Scaffold this active site. Sequence first.
Site, mmCIF file in Angstrom:
data_model
loop_
_atom_site.group_PDB
_atom_site.id
_atom_site.type_symbol
_atom_site.label_atom_id
_atom_site.label_comp_id
_atom_site.label_asym_id
_atom_site.label_seq_id
_atom_site.Cartn_x
_atom_site.Cartn_y
_atom_site.Cartn_z
ATOM 1 N N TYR A 159 0.448 -2.133 22.555
ATOM 2 C CA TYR A 159 0.044 -1.894 21.180
ATOM 3 C C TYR A 159 -0.307 -0.433 20.946
ATOM 4 O O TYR A 159 -0.283 0.007 19.796
ATOM 5 C CB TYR A 159 -1.144 -2.791 20.789
ATOM 6 C CG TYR A 159 -0.845 -4.164 20.159
ATOM 7 C CD1 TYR A 159 0.450 -4.659 20.003
ATOM 8 C CD2 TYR A 159 -1.883 -4.947 19.685
ATOM 9 C CE1 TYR A 159 0.690 -5.882 19.424
ATOM 10 C CE2 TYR A 159 -1.647 -6.163 19.078
ATOM 11 C CZ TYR A 159 -0.362 -6.635 18.967
ATOM 12 O OH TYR A 159 -0.128 -7.856 18.377
ATOM 13 N N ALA B 131 -15.152 -12.951 11.445
ATOM 14 C CA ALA B 131 -14.610 -13.893 10.474
ATOM 15 C C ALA B 131 -13.887 -15.079 11.104
ATOM 16 O O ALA B 131 -13.503 -15.997 10.371
ATOM 17 C CB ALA B 131 -13.644 -13.175 9.526
ATOM 18 N N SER C 26 -4.053 -6.536 8.672
ATOM 19 C CA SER C 26 -3.062 -7.522 9.080
ATOM 20 C C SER C 26 -3.335 -8.829 8.356
ATOM 21 O O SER C 26 -4.491 -9.173 8.095
ATOM 22 C CB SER C 26 -3.092 -7.750 10.593
ATOM 23 O OG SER C 26 -4.298 -8.377 10.986
ATOM 24 N N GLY D 298 -5.170 -11.763 10.614
ATOM 25 C CA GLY D 298 -6.581 -11.646 10.893
ATOM 26 C C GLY D 298 -7.448 -12.118 9.743
ATOM 27 O O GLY D 298 -7.131 -11.944 8.571
ATOM 28 N N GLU E 230 5.019 8.593 -7.432
ATOM 29 C CA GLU E 230 6.470 8.443 -7.459
ATOM 30 C C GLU E 230 7.001 7.527 -6.362
ATOM 31 O O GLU E 230 8.081 6.958 -6.545
ATOM 32 C CB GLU E 230 7.177 9.803 -7.398
ATOM 33 C CG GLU E 230 6.862 10.716 -6.236
ATOM 34 C CD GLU E 230 7.219 12.162 -6.540
ATOM 35 O OE1 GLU E 230 8.099 12.398 -7.395
ATOM 36 O OE2 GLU E 230 6.597 13.067 -5.947
ATOM 37 N N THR F 250 -10.860 -11.224 9.182
ATOM 38 C CA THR F 250 -11.501 -10.033 8.634
ATOM 39 C C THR F 250 -10.519 -9.227 7.804
ATOM 40 O O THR F 250 -10.778 -8.939 6.631
ATOM 41 C CB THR F 250 -12.063 -9.168 9.765
ATOM 42 O OG1 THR F 250 -13.131 -9.860 10.422
ATOM 43 C CG2 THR F 250 -12.560 -7.824 9.239
ATOM 44 N N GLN G 219 -9.257 -5.541 13.191
ATOM 45 C CA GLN G 219 -8.889 -4.944 14.473
ATOM 46 C C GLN G 219 -7.573 -4.188 14.372
ATOM 47 O O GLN G 219 -7.448 -3.068 14.879
ATOM 48 C CB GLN G 219 -8.800 -6.029 15.546
ATOM 49 C CG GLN G 219 -8.230 -5.544 16.870
ATOM 50 C CD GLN G 219 -8.654 -6.405 18.040
ATOM 51 O OE1 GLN G 219 -9.020 -7.566 17.870
ATOM 52 N NE2 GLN G 219 -8.602 -5.840 19.239
ATOM 53 N N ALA G 220 -6.583 -4.782 13.702
ATOM 54 C CA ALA G 220 -5.290 -4.125 13.557
ATOM 55 C C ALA G 220 -5.417 -2.843 12.751
ATOM 56 O O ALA G 220 -4.878 -1.796 13.140
ATOM 57 C CB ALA G 220 -4.299 -5.077 12.894
HETATM 58 N N1 LIG Z 1 0.717 -3.318 15.582
HETATM 59 C C1 LIG Z 1 -0.513 -3.723 15.877
HETATM 60 N N2 LIG Z 1 -0.934 -4.978 15.492
HETATM 61 C C2 LIG Z 1 -2.185 -5.403 15.786
HETATM 62 C C3 LIG Z 1 -3.057 -4.576 16.476
HETATM 63 N N3 LIG Z 1 -4.217 -5.247 16.634
HETATM 64 C C4 LIG Z 1 -4.105 -6.463 16.054
HETATM 65 N N4 LIG Z 1 -2.845 -6.578 15.533
HETATM 66 C C5 LIG Z 1 -2.298 -7.731 14.798
HETATM 67 O O1 LIG Z 1 -3.344 -8.497 14.239
HETATM 68 C C6 LIG Z 1 -3.036 -9.872 14.296
HETATM 69 C C7 LIG Z 1 -4.302 -10.693 14.500
HETATM 70 O O2 LIG Z 1 -5.249 -10.408 13.494
HETATM 71 P P1 LIG Z 1 -6.326 -9.230 13.687
HETATM 72 O O3 LIG Z 1 -5.975 -8.070 12.792
HETATM 73 O O4 LIG Z 1 -6.383 -8.801 15.131
HETATM 74 O O5 LIG Z 1 -7.722 -9.893 13.245
HETATM 75 P P2 LIG Z 1 -8.819 -9.097 12.380
HETATM 76 O O6 LIG Z 1 -8.163 -8.348 11.249
HETATM 77 O O7 LIG Z 1 -9.657 -8.196 13.250
HETATM 78 O O8 LIG Z 1 -9.699 -10.281 11.753
HETATM 79 P P3 LIG Z 1 -10.520 -11.226 12.756
HETATM 80 O O9 LIG Z 1 -9.543 -11.863 13.711
HETATM 81 O O10 LIG Z 1 -11.259 -12.282 11.974
HETATM 82 O O11 LIG Z 1 -11.498 -10.369 13.522
HETATM 83 C C8 LIG Z 1 -2.075 -10.038 15.456
HETATM 84 O O12 LIG Z 1 -1.026 -10.903 15.092
HETATM 85 C C9 LIG Z 1 -1.532 -8.652 15.730
HETATM 86 O O13 LIG Z 1 -0.158 -8.601 15.435
HETATM 87 C C10 LIG Z 1 -2.640 -3.310 16.868
HETATM 88 O O14 LIG Z 1 -3.400 -2.572 17.489
HETATM 89 N N5 LIG Z 1 -1.363 -2.889 16.569
HETATM 90 N N1 LIG Z 2 19.039 23.535 -7.932
HETATM 91 C C1 LIG Z 2 17.856 23.060 -7.476
HETATM 92 N N2 LIG Z 2 17.496 21.794 -7.805
HETATM 93 C C2 LIG Z 2 16.327 21.270 -7.377
HETATM 94 C C3 LIG Z 2 15.448 22.097 -6.544
HETATM 95 N N3 LIG Z 2 14.370 21.345 -6.261
HETATM 96 C C4 LIG Z 2 14.546 20.140 -6.860
HETATM 97 N N4 LIG Z 2 15.716 20.095 -7.521
HETATM 98 C C5 LIG Z 2 16.237 18.947 -8.303
HETATM 99 O O1 LIG Z 2 15.189 18.352 -9.069
HETATM 100 C C6 LIG Z 2 15.313 16.931 -9.082
HETATM 101 C C7 LIG Z 2 13.944 16.322 -8.826
HETATM 102 O O2 LIG Z 2 13.164 16.385 -10.015
HETATM 103 P P1 LIG Z 2 11.794 17.224 -10.026
HETATM 104 O O3 LIG Z 2 11.863 18.306 -11.074
HETATM 105 O O4 LIG Z 2 11.534 17.812 -8.662
HETATM 106 O O5 LIG Z 2 10.686 16.115 -10.389
HETATM 107 P P2 LIG Z 2 9.255 16.498 -11.016
HETATM 108 O O6 LIG Z 2 8.239 16.640 -9.911
HETATM 109 O O7 LIG Z 2 8.813 15.380 -11.927
HETATM 110 O O8 LIG Z 2 9.336 17.781 -11.804
HETATM 111 C C8 LIG Z 2 16.297 16.560 -7.989
HETATM 112 O O9 LIG Z 2 17.406 15.866 -8.566
HETATM 113 C C9 LIG Z 2 16.779 17.863 -7.390
HETATM 114 O O10 LIG Z 2 18.208 17.900 -7.383
HETATM 115 C C10 LIG Z 2 15.908 23.467 -6.228
HETATM 116 O O11 LIG Z 2 15.219 24.233 -5.524
HETATM 117 N N5 LIG Z 2 17.089 23.862 -6.717
HETATM 118 MG MG LIG Z 3 -10.900 -8.841 14.671
#
Ligand SMILES: Nc1nc2c(ncn2[C@@H]2O[C@H](COP(=O)(O)OP(=O)(O)OP(=O)(O)O)[C@@H](O)[C@H]2O)c(=O)[nH]1
Ligand SMILES: Nc1nc2c(ncn2[C@@H]2O[C@H](COP(=O)(O)OP(=O)(O)O)[C@@H](O)[C@H]2O)c(=O)[nH]1
Ligand SMILES: [Mg+2]
Lengths: 429, 429, 437, 437
Positions: free
Chosen positions: C220, C95, C136, C139, C250, C141, C11-12
């Site tokens: 929610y 569940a 979650s 839950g 990364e 499930t 559900q979550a």
């Molecule tokens: N933030 C957020 N949390 C939710 C929401 N719905 C359920 N939860 C969280 O889910 C927890 C309860 O478990 P659920 O995920 O509802 O249960 P389930 O995954 O559907 O599994 P079953 O209960 O067996 O059907 C609660 O503690 C809530 O915090 C949501 O819409 N938003």
């Molecule tokens: N001078 C300059 N440095 C850059 C620029 N874009 C990214 N960098 C540098 O590149 C570094 C990130 O590594 P990057 O080459 O993007 O990772 P990669 O995806 O593995 O190639 C950072 O430390 C940035 O400071 C740019 O447009 N100009």
């Molecule tokens: Mg449920």
Amino acid sequence: MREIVHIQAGQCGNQIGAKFWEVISDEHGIDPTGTYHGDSDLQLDRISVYYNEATGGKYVPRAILVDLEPGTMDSVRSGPFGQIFRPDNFVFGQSGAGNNWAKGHYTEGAELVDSVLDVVRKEAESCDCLQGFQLTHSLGGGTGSGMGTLLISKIREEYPDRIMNTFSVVPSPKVSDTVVEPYNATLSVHQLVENTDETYCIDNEALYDICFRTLKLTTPTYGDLNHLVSATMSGVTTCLRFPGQLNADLRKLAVNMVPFPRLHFFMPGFAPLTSRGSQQYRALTVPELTQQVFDAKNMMAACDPRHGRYLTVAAVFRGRMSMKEVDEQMLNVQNKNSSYFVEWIPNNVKTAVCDIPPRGLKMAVTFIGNSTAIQELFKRISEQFTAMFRRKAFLHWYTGEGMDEMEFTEAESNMNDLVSEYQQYQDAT
Amino acid sequence: MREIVHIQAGQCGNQIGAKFWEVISDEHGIDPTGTYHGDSDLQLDRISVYYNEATGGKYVPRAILVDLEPGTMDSVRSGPFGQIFRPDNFVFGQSGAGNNWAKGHYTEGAELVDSVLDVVRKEAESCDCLQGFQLTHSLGGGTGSGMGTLLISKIREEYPDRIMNTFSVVPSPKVSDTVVEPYNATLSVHQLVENTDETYCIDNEALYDICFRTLKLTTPTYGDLNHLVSATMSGVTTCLRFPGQLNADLRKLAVNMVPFPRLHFFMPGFAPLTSRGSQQYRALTVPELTQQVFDAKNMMAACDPRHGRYLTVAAVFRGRMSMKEVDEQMLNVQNKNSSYFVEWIPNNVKTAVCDIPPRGLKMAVTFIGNSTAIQELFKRISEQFTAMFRRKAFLHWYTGEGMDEMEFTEAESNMNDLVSEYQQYQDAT
Amino acid sequence: MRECISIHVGQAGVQIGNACWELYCLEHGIQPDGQMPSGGGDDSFNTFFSETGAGKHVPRAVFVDLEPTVIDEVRTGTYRQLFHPEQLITGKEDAANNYARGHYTIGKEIIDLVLDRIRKLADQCTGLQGFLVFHSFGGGTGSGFTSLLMERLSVDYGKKSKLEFSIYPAPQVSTAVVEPYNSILTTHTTLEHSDCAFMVDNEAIYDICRRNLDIERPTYTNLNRLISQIVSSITASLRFDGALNVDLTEFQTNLVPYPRIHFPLATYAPVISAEKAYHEQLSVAEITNACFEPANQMVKCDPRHGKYMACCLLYRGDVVPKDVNAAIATIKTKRSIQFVDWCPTGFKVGINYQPPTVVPGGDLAKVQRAVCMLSNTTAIAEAWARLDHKFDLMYAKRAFVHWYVGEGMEEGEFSEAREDMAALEKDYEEVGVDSVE
Amino acid sequence: MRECISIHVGQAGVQIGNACWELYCLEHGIQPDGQMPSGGGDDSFNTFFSETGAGKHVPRAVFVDLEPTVIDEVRTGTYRQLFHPEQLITGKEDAANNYARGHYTIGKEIIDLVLDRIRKLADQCTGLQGFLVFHSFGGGTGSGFTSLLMERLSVDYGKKSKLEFSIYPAPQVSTAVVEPYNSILTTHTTLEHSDCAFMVDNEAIYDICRRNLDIERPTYTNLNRLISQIVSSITASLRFDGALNVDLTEFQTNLVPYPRIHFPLATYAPVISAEKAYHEQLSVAEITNACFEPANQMVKCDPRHGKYMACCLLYRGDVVPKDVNAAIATIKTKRSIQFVDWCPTGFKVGINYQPPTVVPGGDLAKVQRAVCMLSNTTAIAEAWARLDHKFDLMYAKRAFVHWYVGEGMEEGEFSEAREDMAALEKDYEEVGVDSVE
Ligand SMILES: Nc1nc2c(ncn2[C@@H]2O[C@H](COP(=O)(O)OP(=O)(O)OP(=O)(O)O)[C@@H](O)[C@H]2O)c(=O)[nH]1
Ligand SMILES: Nc1nc2c(ncn2[C@@H]2O[C@H](COP(=O)(O)OP(=O)(O)O)[C@@H](O)[C@H]2O)c(=O)[nH]1
Ligand SMILES: [Mg+2]
Ligand SMILES: Nc1nc2c(ncn2[C@@H]2O[C@H](COP(=O)(O)OP(=O)(O)OP(=O)(O)O)[C@@H](O)[C@H]2O)c(=O)[nH]1
Ligand SMILES: Nc1nc2c(ncn2[C@@H]2O[C@H](COP(=O)(O)OP(=O)(O)O)[C@@H](O)[C@H]2O)c(=O)[nH]1
Ligand SMILES: [Mg+2]
């Protein structure tokens, strides 16, 4: 999907089932004829949970009506919601059980159980995906206790995997409508504790005090009591029937409620229950409802939770409310009542929320408390049972219908084990 | 005549190469479409150094664009000058290197290096006279470091005779764009030190400072930094591209600059870099330019030249500039800063002069310096490398892509040897 | 070109997926029907969506839940036309908040179909970078099926990245009694297969909404909107072009030092109401300072109780590299914020040009600058200590073990999961030690 | 009747050659196209130019450089029509200030073509007086290729004269770090094969331009104009008729006392601005005294630090024998100047009638008298002591030896060159000592 098969046994179970189906059809917008005139599409989206769609748009409840005497089912069929049920599901014998658990279980049970189980099987095979069962019955009665125990045992035999709920109107400390209530109740819970998965204990005196203190009803008939019980049923079973931000199905409730396999006896509750005048003065908010359900006088069982400790707690809310304040009010409850929650459970509360409220109220909440204070009720029933069984006052009626006194002693021993188990975790540290 | 093959690896190298080609096409009077619209015949005289003359007067750059992720190359192709490059030269892999030197070198490198070497070969055979290459890349990245190391090694394997030039963006003390910059930087310098012939060390913090102090720019994006780096590039490669009163090709620069085969890591700089307000007050003269380039605050590497001594310095002058006032100002610099120059090199200065200035400025100068203050930078990088390698903080990611820890230890040992090799001439007398 | 397969379990997961795909549709300009009514937005669009020849665009999404109610909410909502009808996978029964039920019994029926749909989407994917999983721990499930799916995807596509967006069990508030059991078991199964799991806490987001946004009735919907903003800030580097582009590989390489320490803490700034947005400047320095405050963390863990070990800042909008550089240097210089000595370079920086988009009817203010901060830090060792203590309290008396035993697992699983989490807590306190000699 | 061949090597050689051929064209009246638009000028013209039947005149020039840019500048300049298109010989890549590269690796491809064209130039000469060579010690191409070319020409032609006009490395400033290595190696090779090499210093000419001509920021052009004036004064005896004619063989016989000591110092007078030319008479005695001052020497070497051993003065214009005779008696009589006792007659005199021609736009003032003074003296021993010290400082640590070793020479050659230069300075101090009786 996620179907439920409802059974009602006993006069008490039949009347509560009638009011339950009245409430369900009312909030789903189905007329007594079974034709849908409701406004919301969500009512029809999950109508398959409880109803079968017959030809012409008529919705037949997935209900089984049982009683060894035909009077109450004839009353139900003559009532406004008599046409709604299928005639075939009305299964009865020509002779009631009186108030004899032996008569209800063995003699008339051995005749009627086959017919009602073919009916239950016919309904069960129609389900796309069958979730658990439900039963309404009275532990103090003969018919309700005996037939309910027999159906519970045989339905657990045939469907061991499925969830299986019961709603028991447990006997009371002061009021007693039947002298052999201790015997019937003791044998009933002895059979239920091995088999059932959830049982919610209703207490007629607690309903009377709720009606008098909160609703201020001068003349509370059984209709109002059944109305409250139907409110609790609709509250617990809402997550299958309506959309919600946190959905909690019956199996989820079982997993959250039952720590150990035998401690599945819950004290339900409901809020708001204010009177006619008090609605104007009281501004209904989530803090007000949370304090109302956690107030002891609101509990639908006579046992005071302050006398015991809470093993687990569940709250199914209905309506629209931000869940931040649901959570914070639950935490203020836990902090104020930290003495009343068992330490070995780190967090006891299971929250659930549903979007659609009942009967046009802006809000509602249904409470289910698994607490150790129910050991007091079991102690009372076992004490009354032992007091009668020392003299064997009424055992000849039960022995005439076949059973042995060994059964009575076994039920007493199992009750002693149950109360010992309930007290063990209160004593644990 | 005297061609250069340009390669740009990584996001940093690709963006700097893009701005470099903007500057080159701008000063040669080539539109983004590749058609010539300049005024001077001298632009066409040496256009073969960097461009190939396609049919219809269209001039395609002698550029090769490599990146294991698509985003920077797609941005270049969609940019205003994306039309100018050959589409075939857009060689690119299917998954990025992360920031992993091992992933860039071994895992994707074995896949893409074949295609990039075919492109390099076709360009090299297209050139009648191949002078050295020019790679742009960042040491801190995964893609740039790994692809640059593998490309540099293979190009030195197949073209041992020709010079290799690289423009490397190094980390600083007070910045970190990636967590694994010490690992990537260390492995890159270990691979580069034996293969490359010249390496120009650009530092992002130094350009940020330069923009703040001299240009007074409130919001210097990476475009301005790439503008400065491209300015230095056009400055160093000007002698092949225009007539000059004292020419200095990049083989001449390498022979003057690398006293010993491993000490080829230099410190670039440029002047004038005044803000919009300051040019009205200041009078652009050769003494002003010399004092500005020899100022520590102008340097594009964070290390202070005053901490170390100088080995060899290169001043490539641009514009109509006298060949006596340059010499007198270099004499004044050597007399004033004699304590900053190693005595075992009697004259440290390599002067070059070119007639054509850039951007319509009247006068300009590009500075190279082989100062021993770069030992501080290598000490810093090796210290951070040892600090992480003591705990083997991130080594399992590099080990998953095939390489061993012995390579890390060998790179650390070679960096220690390099820092000792820089320190011994400080200690020499 | 470069693809990411979103998966939404429980559900979550699915509700957050509704909010997330709403935000993506708003950002890319896709209508809820799937059609684009309308230059640089095209490739940005191609990352998460699959093109169809009729002009409709299909999400690269798989929505899974063992109960059908929430997915039927999706199938009835405004975005019903958007999603593939086949990808919306619905099991028959819930569940019941039971890890054993969700992992073994009900999981084995539907895992094959889920993996088949994932295989078909990956077969369509020209260049796959990894998987984005939403669930979650509390839950059943969510936890159980996420563990099953994670091990299966590790076996199949173990080369590629796998990123979980898990809802941590909150310290004080809770919604389940068996939540520590579910969380311990799923963390035990997930520690081997996960590459990096970003942490979210409902209590922390409630406090953030009440303090900064001045929202006294947070829903929610609001929480999922904030989580959607987090993931959009994370994926905007892949989608939109930028000055410094962060990919998932990364993200993994920078944030995750050791294999078993891969739990960063989410954070967004500026979180601010539109009423107060007019007064404050919201410059790069202010938002960077707001990121590192304890109050604005989306996990209820004071970073002052531990030391940072890998921080990653993702700036989006009108942002200057000199400005972010000065801000990070300032934050490094401050001593209330502490870092491990063995990580001298604790900051990863990413910049891109696209500012965030405010959803209609939202609670956040329109801002030309935004930053998403992701911090691997040792403060969550306290949170795992809390969760392990709760697990010890329940399991010492076998509080709910019989349900899990009925659904097909042994007590050896509980003991092994507890031992593994103890080893995890040890590893955390070990790497928290300052270097000597 | 008498002919010379001018070979211009390296950037310095070819640029000085451009200035020189500009001056010769201006003196003989040849247009840059090569045609004579116009009695005594014809024989003077015939020495340095080869005439064609069509009326065009080709220089007897060979321009060589291993880089093509400077020779292409010549091919685009105004004198493109003047030169033979083939004789502008260009290599493909520069020597990179590397004697090893220019002498051994790159020069060996093109030396055969250069020698063939020099042979073709020599074949059309009735009587070849010798060869004129222009280069710089500092340059790699100049150093290496002039060494190779000098040894090849000494092998081929031999007895004929071979004069260099080299740019001695400046004492304080230098435009190349490897200048000492290049200079030492080229003069090591030049000592055996040369006949008389005339040193020139950029710093000395800058000082002359500042001090006398009253200009402040001079450039190579002016320097090459002055060097052109030197060679024109030297060759005017061959070209134009005169009262006392002097040839290159007589230059060798007079200026060279011993075979290895053949390095005179160039000097021209009157170098004077047009503004100050009005106030001064510029008579024979005045210009003769101006020749011998330390200030006006074109090599930064104080003659007071040594002794002259062969002075040769070349007067041109309105000059009488008695004025020069009285002036030379005066200069001999002075005590400041000093001469070796073993050379009683240290003066060679040449006179001719043609005055110098000022180029358009030049800084030199028009004068009816001019004198060119060439002095072999021991003051250059100090300069070679400085250069040997620089070479020792570099070579003690092997400062740049790997670049030379890569292009195919051994360290034994470096040691041999240093030993030869040691022997040269021992010979200089030997001849600088007075006789025993
Ligand atoms: N933030 C957020 N949390 C939710 C929401 N719905 C359920 N939860 C969280 O889910 C927890 C309860 O478990 P659920 O995920 O509802 O249960 P389930 O995954 O559907 O599994 P079953 O209960 O067996 O059907 C609660 O503690 C809530 O915090 C949501 O819409 N938003
Ligand atoms: N001078 C300059 N440095 C850059 C620029 N874009 C990214 N960098 C540098 O590149 C570094 C990130 O590594 P990057 O080459 O993007 O990772 P990669 O995806 O593995 O190639 C950072 O430390 C940035 O400071 C740019 O447009 N100009
Ligand atoms: Mg449920
Ligand atoms: N007087 C004068 N000196 C020059 C000129 N051109 C170069 N030089 C001198 O030559 C020295 C450097 O050697 P170059 O002659 O430029 O090098 P090169 O002979 O072209 O040989 P390469 O090393 O291959 O370039 C400098 O110190 C200058 O003083 C010129 O046109 N006139
Ligand atoms: N709540 C509720 N309880 C009832 C009702 N009718 C009877 N009861 C209770 O049921 C008990 C009688 O048992 P019952 O089921 O009627 O006996 P049975 O004929 O053997 O099934 C009494 O103690 C009543 O308190 C009713 O309408 N509502
Ligand atoms: Mg040259």
